[PDB]
Design a protein around this ligand. Structure first.
Ligand SMILES: CC(C)C[C@H](NC(=O)[C@@H]1CCCN1C(=O)[C@H](CCCCN)NC(=O)C[C@@H]1O[C@@H](C)[C@@H](O)[C@@H](O)[C@@H]1O)C(N)=O
Ligand SMILES: CC(C)C[C@H](NC(=O)[C@@H]1CCCN1C(=O)[C@H](CCCCN)NC(=O)C[C@@H]1O[C@@H](C)[C@@H](O)[C@@H](O)[C@@H]1O)C(N)=O
Ligand SMILES: [Ca+2]
Ligand SMILES: [Ca+2]
Ligand SMILES: [Ca+2]
Ligand SMILES: [Ca+2]
Ligand SMILES: [Ca+2]
Ligand SMILES: [Ca+2]
Ligand SMILES: [Ca+2]
Ligand SMILES: [Ca+2]
Lengths: 114, 114, 114, 114
C-alpha cells in the first residue's frame, strides 16, 4: 500500500520535521501538490533533526514524503493519528537498508499550527 | 485518563522533541523514572522546535511529559503508535487556553534510535 | 480533553463495534448528530462483542461514543488513526473502575465501508 | 514494509475480530508463534463481523494476520495504537482488489482483556 502520502485540509500550514538514525545520509523531500516544497539532508545515528520547516498544504492538501539514501528510495511506513479530534500527526518511518528498524529517516508532520 | 506517560523498553535511547504553537511561553519537562531528564521552553506560534534531546529510558522505561505555561500545567492528550511493529512514536499534545487546538506544546518521543 | 468524539466525513456509513471486559454491565451509546443512533449493553470479561452496527454519519459527520455502567459514566480515552491515507479507525477505551485497564468497554469505529 | 505482524506481551489473552467489506469472500488467518490460531471466513459489504475470538499470544507474543481472497493474499496495512499507555489496538486493513479502500477485511486485535 502507498505510504508517506497524506491528505491534509487545504491551504493549511503544517510543520514537517525530519530526524536521522542511520550511517547513511538521508535526503528527505516533502512534496506539496506533487511539487517539492522542502528538502532536508543529513547523516546521524543519533536522531539529529536534519531539518524542519513550515509549509502550506495548498489547494490540494496533498502532502507526500519521499526519502532517498545512497541513490535509492527508502521503504516507507506511515500513519496519521488524530488526538482529541483536533491534533494531527502524519508520521513516516523509512528503511534504507536491511535491518528494518525503519527509523533511518523519521518524519513528523503536524498540524494545525499557531 | 492519565496522559503523557509512556512505558518504553528499558535502557533504551529515545528522542524527545518539542514544538510550540502558542502566544504562551511553553515549558516542557520530560521525566524518566519520575526524575526530570530534559526541559525545553520557547514561545512561537510557528511550530518552533523549541528543543530536542536524546535520552535513555533507564531501568524503568517510564517516561512522562509535562507541559506548563506561565506556571500552569496544560491539559495533555497523548497516544503511542507503532508502525511495522518496529517504529514507535509517543505523541503528546497540550492546551494552555480555551481554543482547544491542543498544539500549544506538541511533544514527540520516538524510538528506537540508531 | 474531550474524548470519544470524532468528526467523520458527512453522510458516510461507518461501523461501530463494542467489546466488554468488565465485571460490570457496560452501556455504550453511539450518538450521531447528538442523538443516540445505537446502544449496546452487556457484561463479559471475555471481549464479547456486545454490539456492532453500521450507521451513517449524517450531515454533520459528528459521532460520539459514551460509556456508562448502570448510569455512571466511565472515563474515556480515544484517538483516530488512518492507514494508507484511506482507512480510518476511531478508537475508544473506557474505565469503569480503579484498575485503569481502560478496556471495560472498548469501541472501534471504522470507515469507509463497502 | 511488513504489515499485519504484531508483538504482543507474551502469554497474554487478546481479542481478534474481522469485518468484511467486499464482494469477495474474505479468509482471515491469525497466526500465533507462526502457527494458525484462528481462521475466519465470510462475505459482507456491510462490515459484518465474520469472526471474533479470544486467543493467547503464547511464548513469542508474535501475532500475525494474513488475509486472502480467492487464494490470493490481500495487500495489508496495519499499525498499533496504545491509549493511556494501557489499551492496545493492533489494526489491520486489507485490499483484495484495485479500488484501494483497504477495508475488504478489517481486523482489530485488542488487549488486554478481562
Ligand atoms: C546502504 C545505506 C543504508 C548506508 C551505507 N552503509 C554502508 O555502506 C555499509 C554497508 C551496510 C552496512 N553499512 C554501514 O555503513 C552501517 C554499518 C554499521 N550500517 C548501515 O549503513 C545500515 C544503516 O545505518 C545503521 C547504523 C543503522 O542505523 C541501520 O538501521 C541503517 O539502515 C552508508 N552510507 O554508510
Ligand atoms: C484572555 C486574556 N489573556 C490574554 O489576552 C493573553 C495575554 C497575552 C496574550 N494572551 C492571549 O490570550 C493570547 C492572545 N492567546 C493565547 O495565549 C492562546 C494561545 O495562543 C494563541 C496564539 C493560540 O496558539 C492558542 O491556541 C493558544 O492557546 C485574559 N487573561 O483576559
Ligand atoms: Ca535501517
Ligand atoms: Ca536506523
Ligand atoms: Ca491552544
Ligand atoms: Ca495553539
Ligand atoms: Ca477497568
Ligand atoms: Ca477491564
Ligand atoms: Ca477493496
Ligand atoms: Ca471494500
Amino acid at each position: 500500500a502507498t505510504q508517506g502520502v497524506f491528505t491534509l485540509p487545504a491551504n493549511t500550514r503544517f510543520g514537517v520535521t525530519a530526524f536521522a538514525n542511520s550511517s547513511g545520509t538521508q535526503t528527505v523531500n516533502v512534496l506539496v501538490n506533487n511539487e517539492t516544497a522542502a528538502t532536508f539532508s543529513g547523516q546521524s545515528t543519533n536522531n539529529a533533526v536534519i531539518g524542519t520547516q513550515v509549509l502550506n498544504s495548498g489547494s490540494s492538501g496533498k502532502v507526500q514524503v519521499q526519502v532517498s539514501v545512497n541513490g535509492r528510495p527508502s521503504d516507507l511506513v506511515s500513519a496519521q493519528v488524530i488526538l482529541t479530534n483536533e491534533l494531527n500527526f502524519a508520521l513516516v518511518g523509512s528503511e534504507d537498508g536491511t535491518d528494518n528498524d525503519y527509523n533511518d529517516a523519521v518524519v513528523v508532520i503536524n498540524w494545525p499550527l499557531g
